[model samples]
Target chain A: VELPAGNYILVGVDIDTTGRRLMDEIVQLAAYTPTDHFEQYIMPYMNLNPAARQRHQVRVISIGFYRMLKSMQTYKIIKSKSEIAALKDFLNWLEQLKTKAGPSSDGIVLIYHEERKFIPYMILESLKKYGLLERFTASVKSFANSINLAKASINYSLRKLSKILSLDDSLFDGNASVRAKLAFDVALQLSNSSEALENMFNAIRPFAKLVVSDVLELDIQIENLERQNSFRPVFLNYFKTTLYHRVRAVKFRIVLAENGFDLNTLSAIWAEEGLDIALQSIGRLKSKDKAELLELLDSYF
Target chain B: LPAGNYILVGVDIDTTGRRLMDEIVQLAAYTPTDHFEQYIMPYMNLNPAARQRHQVRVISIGFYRMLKSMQTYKIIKSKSEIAALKDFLNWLEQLKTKAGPSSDGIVLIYHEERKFIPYMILESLKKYGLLERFTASVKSFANSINLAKASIKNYSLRKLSKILSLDADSLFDGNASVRAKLAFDVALQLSNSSSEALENMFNAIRPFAKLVVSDVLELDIQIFLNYFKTTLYHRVRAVKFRIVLAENGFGLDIALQKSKDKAELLELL
Candidate 1:
């Protein structure tokens, strides 16, 4: 199953952590392709989950000192490796993939969902902390972001970026091996990207992470784009247009999610308020379509 | 936010986290003619997330250690948050004579979200009663991204720099002074945007939210801190220590007392 020379394989890499505050140690890590997979649970150097983490700050009525288990028992009962050891194992898995990738292959490109922008940095910093980043650099070609890929390949069919980015964002919730599979589905689509005069896959490379040292074929295409139709404003246009929707989505999410509404709630309100959003989107809804939408609004009252 | 009549000072603050108790570890300022970057000792351990990002380390005593300055090492003097803010204020005054009349205040254009550095800063400033002197001379504290969002699709300093092909000079993305300089560089590129857009950008960081100090988290700061003898309070660090003393309770008396607040503080030697 080795690809021809210069062809790269994508490993859908993901990590779970103690918290999202950007400092959390990667408590669990996982990744895979059609042939293989990896997962590890890491013991944090600090025991402070949210409760203990909060105790160190100052407040009045304040004895604000933090508490820790005197025994290493809290984490010991559960099996896990130290952060450095876990990272070493993670690196070894990646190195195995690089060699297992076959010499003819162009090594690996790491894939991450990376919707919030912190994931890559957190992982990179942790790797660098353990002096593992240079090894990581040698192992991966690039981080092909799932959200950007989804937009390029699947945007027309989906409304939410999260839904588009993975087959089920919630699948990672319970299924242990699901993310690598879902990430593979997203990464696998780029193989046939250049069936083009009208190709978008070539354009999507700029959005990928600079796993640096180069990926020649990816760069070759960008060089081709530069020699080709490089002047079009659409790249910049898409870049700007996406920001507004993304910014709005942030606001729209948090305000209603101070926790409240859902899409059904929104749709019903728009329908009852005589908002033209659903109407214009369909561009003049039929009598039956409009009637059905109105009927659904009856549930709310 | 201003195009014409003002002094633009690039500023940045690094913190442990946004959790109510997390504190600022570094405050950096850059003006066209001058610059300041100083690390502050946090009351708690630095968040590994922010520690790597800001590239500064905290210890309660002795020499200030800052490693992984993008894999290079450097040392900086460290002090209390109250002390750091005081140095930040003194740094502000050095640039005051450079300010033109139409603008009585200096603009601090930082490139972080409001809840993070902005909230921590205002909270710390309010704590010290130095907020009035600060606000009197400071008109707007702007987010560089918010301004760039209006024009350049707001992005990471490196990503934005790459797209524009701006000279980043091997920019250390985690260092506060580098980030402050980058923010200033971003301001230098804003001639294409309208004043109208800039006004709205000011509005983004202007609505100061005053959150009450709740009992969610607390940091018990140690009173006695040790410092190494020579590399200790040389120059700016020494002056800042005085200002912190002045701000708290020390009186300099009639000696260097032409300084109205005769801040009771002293020398290391």
Candidate 2:
């Protein structure tokens, strides 16, 4: 949901000198920026990539839920200058709306990405100071950190334009279920890039059964189109061929169904009941039967 | 549920101490009818044997005497001690003859000390063929004491005046020797009885003493140390004794001292 608007001052770090994707969706946002472009992006880092990332990481403490709880009322977004100023404007609007709300009003949520080193530390330190450490367990922290680190490394590695599209399938493998879920969640949150959304959803397809129905069903087909190809199919032939192959796979067909009550749901329920669904699936269905199952789903959904 | 005169006497074990006096005063304060007659045992003396055994100050007599010149039974003192059951029976016989045959009556009181008293009284009446002629009941003091404690305290001076059957100003006057004498006389009469009764009476007053202790400690800690630091410098505060003080310099010192002393005194209580 979009927040109500007010005045906001944003500070972007590590993106300028590091050649990282800084501000993508927040540049056009309605906000008050008092600082110059150079001040916002360049000087603080001596030089952007290596210096800024190192300095910020060493200085900043982990951001905790407790600190977020306090500042969430007065929203603050840490993002870059060029791409899009969506977060900065949203925070300002939320702060404006907070003043008129009553004491019993439901609290607002603030989000941060792993692209910045300081945000995670800020969250953890705030939570500890406020006696809200009990709100999250050690496992939760590890899960959050791994997901955040994964995103940071992805953004960092992708800086080399030559290596952007040279990623292997192993990039999405072996993550804790929680980390995988968080990545998909961020994808749904920033439904601005259709191609990014498609890739995120597809990467999450193997682990999607772990999440609830409402979250999994949040389709990002439109966002996938708008973000990658600017709402147009730049690689239409390649995409069409990929979609055809995916439709032919029974597991892929199950993911396309918005209902989320087929193979994935069955597996999750089987696990919950302490039944070995994988063991049960051993050689049970022939190749023709699996193909027939895919066909049935395409026709039904 | 017939409409007739019913006599309900609340027999409490100890009527000598502050708590029972407070209860009697309370009862007088709230009730419109004067429904009580306090019988103080004036001849009661200390038993040295009991005093040596229990390390208590006073002793108690098993039998209690009703005051005033009313037709009443006097306790029998014969077989063992200065008092016995036969004397009371004789006195009851005398009371019966004086009150006459038409006096349809009963006796009710807390009779826990002697389980045989009620049965003996019933048997004595049966000997005269008057057992069926009178209605009798005896109840323990446990329920009575609990009920009295649970009753609301009567704060209205007008109601107190009415219950006492006296003028409020005259009854509560500071220099009223009559009130003073009455309190002392009542307490003395109670101690004259069994010390067990007096001990029970003292037990009842413990909560009030505890309240006083709590208030004193509150002043020593909250007001004295917090405000009048010079006056309370050498003294320990309340929460220190309870081991619930916050982390302040003064609290830390007191806590250390108290911990040592507490270990030494552990086996005493």
Candidate 3:
């Protein structure tokens, strides 16, 4: 059955690790929701990366929650076959959080930083490896929405929000989760008041005016330089060549979305072929032809 | 009259500044028999003392004076402070080697205000690890002049020049060559003075004089020199006697006799 609308739960998850390693287990986990609900858990499973271990200049050392666990090792917490018991306890604690929302809720949206889009998938993979996926899949599948805020988007939003609230940029200098927390707070505050949100959006428009003007200036310079040089094929070819073609394609989609165009299907097509392909197509065109393409794109505003 | 028995050098110098920031700009040394003077153009620029607040007036003043001197003088060559100091040491080495083994070390005499020069020279020598090769004692020329005269007013170089009936303007000309000439004349005058006056003045200042001697030589002889001059002289004589006996294949009997003589001398003392 389809879940009713406006009955959604947003889950913000942040993980701390030694580095990006499959062997490195999460040291800390924090989750936040818009309902003024927050939860933090520290796990004793500290599989530090080899480089991190070398930096501390020790083969084995207690860190984070593991330090407390090491200190309490003298206690008889492990009484033969207690490993399975501890795992079960942790699994149960995680499972109980699923019942916090109503059964009629539409879905859970997983919000995490763009670079860490694989974290939820990694968690699922670990659960599958341990044969615990069957127990957790239902609640996990309920996570119907997932948002990965790009670094650029996060920075733009932060600057815009800082200007709106009259706060310093330093206030939002912590982890992605902290920034996400602020974004959620601001969104919730503005959700009930369209007038205030519109005012803030208007204030942010002035901020983008300089950037838009700079882009326009660069565009004009490129056109003039092209005319003067007779639009060399070498320059056109160079513009089309980039190491991060696929990533650039994705970024192009973001660029389009940022400028008020909602062409999801077109972006998917570009992403498939890689964004430089479009630029490569442009490379074959004459200077006059390229100018026409830029004009067409600019006319959308 | 030639004073062939002594190796005395009167030195005059100018520096970029006074105290810690001071860098040697010119060095002139004059001996009765020879003279050496050089305009030491420094490679390392003057410490920007005026740019940094809380520096003393003397430091900036001295720097300006050095600049003025550099402008007026025709320097034959410019050298890094390190290079100039090296050249100065080489010159000293030549003077010492030329003086012969019988002559005592070069007695470096300078103005009292320029007392910092010897320490700076020693430090530079140490920096180049050439400290051990240097052996000289620095004495104040003004101190010697004061000791010789019972009643004197203004014992500065200019005043001393006037009192001695020398051309005061030429002696204090601030030119390296002229300064070298004045220094040479002063050294000759001091060397010709009564032995009693020289001995008394030397004795008074010898203990306080800074000596740059080799570490090995200091270990071998300075310990005795610090304790007793008579014993040091006796020890040197014994060393010479032992060397002669060894060369002649003289047995332990002769050495025992020498020791007995030393013991008798000690008892008499």
- Return the top candidate by TM-score: 1
Give DockQ: model 1.
0.02
- Measured against the true structure, the TM-scores of the candidates, in listed sequence, are 0.34, 0.15, 0.30
Q: Which ranking of candidates, highest TM-score first? A: 1, 3, 2
TM-score of chain B of each: 0.62, 0.23, 0.54
iRMSD, all candidates: 21.9, 42.8, 35.4
lDDT string for model 1 (A104-205, tens) is 766676666546644465667676553467778777657666666655554332124326443453343322245545555554554344243113234335
iRMSD value for model 1: 21.9
**Cα displacement (Å) at residue B170, model 2:** 8.3
Q: Highest lDDT, which number?
A: 1
Which candidate, 2 or 3, has the higher TM-score?
3
Name the runs in model 3 displaced over 4 angstroms. A1-301, B1-6, B43-76, B136-153, B168-172, B180-184, B190-210, B213-269
Residue A191 accuracy (lDDT) in model 1: 34
Model 2 agreement with the true structure over B233-264: per-residue lDDT tens digits: 33454335444333211132322324554444
lDDT for each candidate structure = 0.52, 0.27, 0.41
A75-120 per-residue lDDT for model 3 (tens digits): 3211111122333444564445556666674334444433323345
